[PDB]
């Protein structure tokens, strides 16, 4: 009568622990959703559901959104948190694809904070401000020339451009060294994201390269946003601790 | 009944629910710890293979066995992943991936029908402007009308593939279908490159995203008419197999 329900409930509790350990919040919700008298069930369901929704729609976690004011900080940190969570569960193709856009976002954001007016945003895309001084543009032209490219003020800025801009404005920036781990997976990422190839982790030191690109993002965050509190880099661990206390 | 029998039946129903939501990794998690679970070894093996194939973008064996053409297989496989994540309401991820699949389909078509038009450098597509001066002239006129300048150093993406087809084959059924994918380009930029939150209820984003996914399916029917209709529903078929092991 009650022995059966006690067994079922204790077993579900351990199952949810395993799933939560693998960041499978939607599966955990699935196991608890129909359980009537389960202790902390309502709060558990609410928290698992809001978390799954935040991940699916790329909504910054409420704790983060409430603690910090800078929108670029919050987005960078949030997408790092998702990135590291995907790596930790070995969603490796997804990790490989996302890392470059995060790196690009951090560098763009960094430049826009420290040299505002250098870059302008038009229709959601970054470009050199056409009001920029020839002193800057001349050096940039020289860097493009090393890269076998011509100067075009109307061209959309991408990762190579951000690296060149930073090379001119702050050549000692540690960002310029951290980004190399992101460049090292560029061809692999092209292969997976655009040519739809299989990711062979056991070839070309890919396990290691992908890991190092994720660590590179974390290091870039420490450099660009030193005001991020260290505990917020461990959001998922903290969240799993909270879930364990409810169970 | 034997407690083991009660545990086995409970796990059986839990796994069926997880499978029904395409949570194969969670299903694996629940069955992995069960030693004497009927067909447990075969299930564990099958769920692991599927999980790994999804994580590394390895074409499913059944697809690899039924179909011969590499581009067909990659296109269909990535549509299957796209639609499976979309069915799970991973809408931001869906929005990001749909464009790359459409680009792959058009690029494949262009490389068959105008093989000298695109030159591939380090796995990336670029307009071969030296061999195709008549095309380059028309393409430049097209960009010039849009107050955009022609830039041979740019990697070709969906807008360029669409322009290529508009010039070379304006009657294309592919060109009609891909418009729904072009329509989510700015939204995708916002989510993928600016790290914004996806608000499905704004500007009927939900509709736009649905139409982009259907566009891929229509394009596959155009390019690869030999794909059997049931293969667009791989996961349903796969779940049937799992259900037979769980009976």
TrEMBL record, chain B:
Residues 73-243 form the Csm6 HEPN domain. This is Type III-A CRISPR-associated protein Csm6. The lineage of its organism: Bacteria, Bacillati, Bacillota, Bacilli, Bacillales.
